[PDB]
Nucleic acid binder design. Structure first.
Ligand SMILES: Nc1nc2c(ncn2[C@@H]2O[C@H](COP(=O)(O)OP(=O)(O)OP(=O)(O)O)[C@@H](O)[C@H]2O)c(=O)[nH]1
Ligand SMILES: [Mg+2]
Lengths: 167, 949
RNA sequence: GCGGAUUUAACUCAGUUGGGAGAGCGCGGAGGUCCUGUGUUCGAUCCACAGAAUUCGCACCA
């Protein structure tokens, strides 16, 4: 039971880090902009079985995102990530959504505000309204402290399996 | 080239390939956008269905769309037109759009962009022709396609959400007016017929899409087209069809939110005769959430209409206020709905209503009629506030449910606080009986299933008097009679509550005891149980995991605030079982190898540190003779020191020995963090013996920085305890810590220094001199390093902050002379520029950095000796007049201050001449500096906004 | 729909980029939780975050 999950967000929001954290457990402190797309088969366990997620880590950099929307083809789910430290990475969250749905008619989209470990916050909590205007699941998360790091996958898995009881 | 692209894309879409192949591919496709010719290749593919892959056509379609974005009308009206006829010939055929969804969706996207560049003038027939085709080929699949194009056009012209450019907006408003002035009447007529047609045919799919277009577009189109008799009738009907019920309530709403003149909504709002729908509105929560949202929509409107003083006709005020009081039943019915999604869909209406309500009670007293309403509102709000008496509490601190609940409580409280505003006595009484009532009922239940009711009782209590902390919260400022707070608190402290097993209950109890400890300032005879409570097996020795740690902090806060007397000895005795430290090395997420950090981060040691601090507060505010107090003092410092010596002498490398040493130093540091600053106190001797012990451990483990933080910390506490009795060894401390200095501790270091610079001001001067040279070049080096990641940028800003604040301290405490001691001569120039650089960065960097830059001028006000304070002073000019070209007032406000201080010239001869010379503005600036602190600021802000505009 | 200001004794206004805070007026003295809550620090009125009250724009509906 493998599902295609495209991960998209603005550049520097921590998409790749998020991935590494779950693939190896390591937290990369240096920023190396992803180029094109990197794809890793992150997997998981559940009361009912093993769900695999083929994650398509996309680049959110205008410079290195060749085939920008192409990668969303036949995607089965997705995560839209933004940086709580960087304001504009939220101001653009609509787009990422708009684009994603243009290719994938109706898929379970999870909106994630990353970097919540850093105290100060440029994207204040009163501005985060997109998920409630687009009926989208949201999660304040952190690739550094692992804060809520499994919420996004669990939710999706619980939908792609239609089994709310899934864990 | 075609078959190539088809491969490239195919290459990129297969992650089962070598990177080498992807590179070429990924760049080939991206080359298409960059290239002047690239798109010609996609122009040929997108239409080709018999020979190309959807996967390919997609990437070509997308390309083409991005390409259509950047072509200026006038300069490319040939290519834009060229790609249109192509898309249109394609769209006309109707035989490939029933390909996969992405291929139809992406088509829509291109067309709309095309439309966006040609419609006003170049594409006159866009709606006539497109519609004529959609109608000609009579099939839903096609109507849907059309419907979505309309939604897409709205996405690009009605969505407030996307980047709000002033241009795109002026460019967007044109397309709106064009559509308005040309084919709006028919766009709506077209849609209508479809709603009507597919409606009778029971084709709910398309009717849905229709209802959306109406929802989306109502925001910005002639309302009249939408609110005619025949179309409305069709809607009200949809309000009774399971399949269409919701879309209908969503569009119904939009019609209601369409913005207009207050007298204008009233009619519309009236004409919709929506109350009957409300009257009926069964178990479908999604729907109820829709109805709620509609009621809320209508509610928020009417309240805003009733507050405008514009049209004074009470006719308006009568029907408007009549319709509002009419909505009240509903507002309560849904506010109380068990489903939390539903109730919240009305908060905004409640929010505004209440506001309007206390604006009206500021004039006259509320009507018996309303006093009930509020009372009935509280009845609801109270219901939402309680835990569900069905699902047992989750011991999961990560349960999204508990997080969503706490959010609603945070809101449900402001509703109570506003109600309070409208009538504090109505709220007061009502809450007292709610808390009393709830506790009464709790006693009639098996402990296992009574907690929800108690947790709610102690919750309201906990909040009832938040902020109300003056002796007036407890007793009437005139009769001196008790306050409903005093009465609620009393009840609770006297209630059995404290004997209940449940966590939420026990915690919340201690929280209440801490928060309102001042209450007990009067009833001093009641303190022993509160102290014995924390102490006993429920409060501090609790067998619950979350409570035990959290308990120790509260007891410390409680004791800290409840100092007088007679509970000293027993409290100290009971703490005993809890003071021996046992931190074990543990594995972590970031530590395959247990780290002092990981080991400790998983212990309750940080929390336990409060006990040590407590035990020190008990011993300084307790009825214990100098002998007895000094006895406990030296009995604990010798046991800790002792745990350090045994740990130090064994293998210093062991994490266990390291941990052991760290904690022993931390506990002693927190023990001293409870004693009062340096009269001869008993503890002094005992704390001075401990000071020597730091060096002992600093000598052997000074290598490890963890121990170093623990040292910079503990010694600062002891210095704030001993004071001058340590001053002679301060330099030996400073010196050691310096060499093991790192980059991670450049900030723990700076504060340790000013911490001391404060305790002994003049004394620390000479030490700082010999040390500034080291601290400076380190800071200079880590701040010059452009960050390679978030954490880096984070570590930098913090440094930036303390660095400036350090230098501000130096100057404000009288240290400037040290910067000049030859040890730091080569360092003056860059220090100033350092600060000058932080000011031109982008506010925290500019308001405080610009401020430091100013004091630096006042302290060095004469060319006498400072050979780089003129050019520096003068160099600050471009900052004061060019920075703000590319929060901002504090930025500009202090930018002026620098101007002023300098001002108490070189600008006339030298500055204006370099920059484009503004004769008018150049003399108004000198007039401001010369003849206007307050006045000059004004000139300056208005001045620049002007210079900039 | 975005975006900013404001909120210090009875009164009335000052003022610091965190070291405990005041002049006029008003009963030799007296009188403030420096809007609230939470956090970060050895410590905050002055920092971070969350919120309230008062309020000024800009955009959309036009
Ligand atoms: N403090 C903190 N920093 C984070 C977190 N996630 C990411 N970062 C920082 O952001 C950097 C990683 O950004 P990336 O994940 O590489 O950004 P990216 O995903 O490659 O951006 P794309 O290449 O467009 O996908 C790291 O250096 C981290 O310091 C987080 O959860 N907490
Ligand atoms: Mg990436």
């Amino acid at each position: 039971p493998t599902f295609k999950l495209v991960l998209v967000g603005d550049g520097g929001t921590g998409k790749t880090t998020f991935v590494k954290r779950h693939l190896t457990g390591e937290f990369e402190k240096k920023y190396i902009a992803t180029i094109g797309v990197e794809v890793h088969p992150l997997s998981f366990y559940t009361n009912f079985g093993e769900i695999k997620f083929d994650v398509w880590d996309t680049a959110g950099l205008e410079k290195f995102g060749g085939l920008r929307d192409g990668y969303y083809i036949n995607a089965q789910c997705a995560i839209i990530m933004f940086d709580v430290t960087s304001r504009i990475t939220y101001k653009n969250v609509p787009n990422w959504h708009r684009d994603l749905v243009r290719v994938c008619e109706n898929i379970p989209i999870v909106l994630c505000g990353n970097k919540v470990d850093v105290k100060e916050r440029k994207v204040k909590a009163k501005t985060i309204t997109f998920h409630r205007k687009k009926n989208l699941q949201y999660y304040d998360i952190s690739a550094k402290s692992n804060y809520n790091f499994e919420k996004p996958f669990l939710w999706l898995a619980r939908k792609l399996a239609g089994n709310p009881q899934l864990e | 080239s075609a078959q190539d692209v088809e491969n490239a894309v195919e290459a990129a879409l297969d992650p089962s390939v070598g990177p080498i192949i992807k590179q070429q591919a990924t760049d080939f496709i991206g080359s298409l956008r960059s290239s002047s010719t690239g798109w010609k290749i996609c122009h040929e593919i997108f239409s080709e269905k018999t020979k190309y892959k959807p996967s390919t056509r997609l990437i070509c379609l997308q390309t083409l769309s991005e390409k259509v974005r950047e072509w200026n009308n006038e300069s490319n009206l040939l290519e834009l037109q060229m790609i249109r006829d192509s898309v249109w010939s394609y769209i006309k055929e109707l035989s490939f759009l029933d390909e996969p969804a992405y291929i139809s969706n992406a088509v829509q996207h291109l067309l709309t962009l095309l439309f966006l560049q040609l419609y006003p003038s170049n594409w006159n027939d866009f709606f006539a022709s497109l519609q004529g085709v959609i109608a000609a080929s009579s099939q839903s699949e096609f109507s849907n396609f059309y419907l979505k194009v309309l939604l897409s056009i709205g996405d690009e012209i009605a969505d407030s959400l996307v980047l709000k450019t002033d241009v795109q907006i002026q460019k967007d408003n044109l397309v709106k007016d064009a559509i308005r002035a040309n084919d709006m009447s028919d766009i709506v007529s077209f849609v209508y017929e479809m709603m009507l047609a597919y409606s009778n045919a029971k084709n709910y799919g398309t009717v849905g899409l229709c209802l959306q277009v109406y929802a989306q577009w109502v925001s910005w189109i002639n309302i009249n087209l939408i609110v005619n008799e025949p179309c409305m009738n069709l809607l009200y009907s949809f309000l009774q069809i399971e399949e269409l019920r919701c879309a209908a309530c969503e569009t119904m709403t939009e019609i209601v939110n369409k913005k207009m003149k207050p007298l204008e909504k009233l009619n519309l709002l009236n004409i919709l005769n929506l109350n009957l729908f409300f009257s009926k509105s069964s178990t479908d929560p999604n729907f109820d959430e829709h109805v709620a949202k509609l009621i809320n929509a209508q509610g928020v409107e009417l309240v805003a209409i009733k507050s405008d003083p514009s049209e004074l006709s009470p006719e308006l005020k009568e029907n408007c206020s009549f319709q509002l009081y009419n909505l009240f039943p509903y507002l309560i019915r849904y506010l109380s709905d068990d489903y939390d999604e539903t109730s919240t869909a009305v908060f905004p209406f409640l929010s505004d209503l209440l506001v309007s309500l206390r604006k009206e009670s500021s004039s006259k007293e509320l009507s018996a009629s309303l006093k009930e309403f509020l009372k009935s509102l509280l009845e609801a709000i109270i219901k939402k506030m309680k835990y569900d008496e069905s699902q047992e509490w989750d011991d999961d601190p990560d349960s999204e449910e508990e997080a969503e609940f706490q959010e609603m409580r945070k809101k449900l409280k402001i509703f109570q606080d506003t109600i309070n505003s409208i009538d504090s006595s109505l709220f007061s009484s009502y809450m007292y009986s709610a808390i009393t009532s709830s506790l009464s009922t709790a006693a009639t239940l098996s402990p296992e299933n009574s907690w929800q009711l108690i947790e709610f009782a102690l919750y309201e209590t906990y909040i009832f008097g938040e902020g109300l902390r003056g002796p007036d919260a407890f007793f009437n400022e005139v009769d001196k009679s008790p306050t409903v707070l005093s009465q609620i608190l009393a009840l609770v402290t006297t209630s059995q509550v404290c004997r209940h097993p449940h966590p939420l209950v026990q915690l919340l109890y201690m929280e209440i005891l801490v928060r309102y400890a001042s209450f007990f300032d009067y009833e001093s005879a009641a303190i022993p149980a509160l102290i014995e409570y924390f102490v006993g097996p429920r409060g501090i020795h609790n067998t619950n995991e979350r409570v035990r740690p959290r308990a120790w902090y509260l007891f410390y806060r409680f004791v800290k605030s409840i100092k007088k007397v007679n509970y000293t000895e027993s409290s100290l005795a009971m703490l005993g079982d809890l003071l021996n430290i046992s931190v074990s090395p543990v594995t972590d997420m970031d530590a395959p190898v247990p780290t002092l950090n990981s080991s400790i981060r998983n212990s309750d040691f940080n929390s336990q540190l409060y006990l040590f601090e407590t035990v020190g507060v008990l011993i300084s505010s307790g009825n214990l003779t100098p002998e007895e107090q000094a006895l406990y003092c030296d009995s604990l410092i010798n046991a800790l020191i002792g745990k350090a010596n045994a740990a130090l002498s064994s293998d210093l490398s062991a994490l266990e020995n390291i941990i052991s040493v760290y904690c022993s130093l931390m506990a002693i540091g927190n023990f001293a963090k409870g004693f009062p600053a340096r009269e001869e106190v008993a503890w002094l001797a005992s704390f001075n013996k401990a000071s020597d012990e730091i060096f002992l451990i600093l000598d052997r483990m000074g290598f490890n920085e963890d121990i170093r933080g623990a040292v910079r910390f503990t010694s600062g506490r002891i210095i704030n305890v001993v004071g001058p009795d340590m001053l002679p060894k301060v330099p030996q401390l400073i010196s050691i810590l310096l060499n093991s200095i790192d980059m991670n501790e450049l900030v723990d270091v700076l504060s340790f220094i000013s911490q001391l610079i404060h305790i002994y001001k003049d004394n620390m001067m000479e030490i700082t001199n010999r040390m500034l040279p080291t601290l400076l070049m380190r800071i200079f080096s880590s701040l010059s390093a452009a960050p390679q990641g978030t954490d880096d940028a984070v570590k930098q800003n913090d440094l930036r902050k303390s660095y400036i604040s350090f230098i501000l301290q130096l100057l404000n405490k009288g240290f400037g002379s040290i910067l000049f001691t030859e040890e730091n001569q080569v360092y003056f120039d860059p220090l100033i520029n350092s600060i000058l650089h932080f000011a031109n960065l982008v506010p925290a960097t500019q308001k405080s950095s610009i401020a430091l830059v100013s004091k630096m001028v006042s302290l060095w006000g004469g060319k006498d000796g400072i050979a780089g304070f003129e050019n520096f002073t003068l160099s600050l000019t471009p900052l004061c007049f060019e920075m703000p070209v590319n929060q901002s007032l504090v930025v500009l406000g202090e930018l002026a201050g620098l101007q002023k201080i300098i001002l108490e010239s070189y600008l006339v001869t030298v500055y204006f001449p370099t920059v484009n010379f503004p004769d008018v503005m150049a003399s108004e600036y000198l007039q401001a500096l010369s003849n206007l602190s307050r006045s000059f600021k004004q000139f300056f802000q208005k001045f620049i906004q002007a210079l900039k505009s």
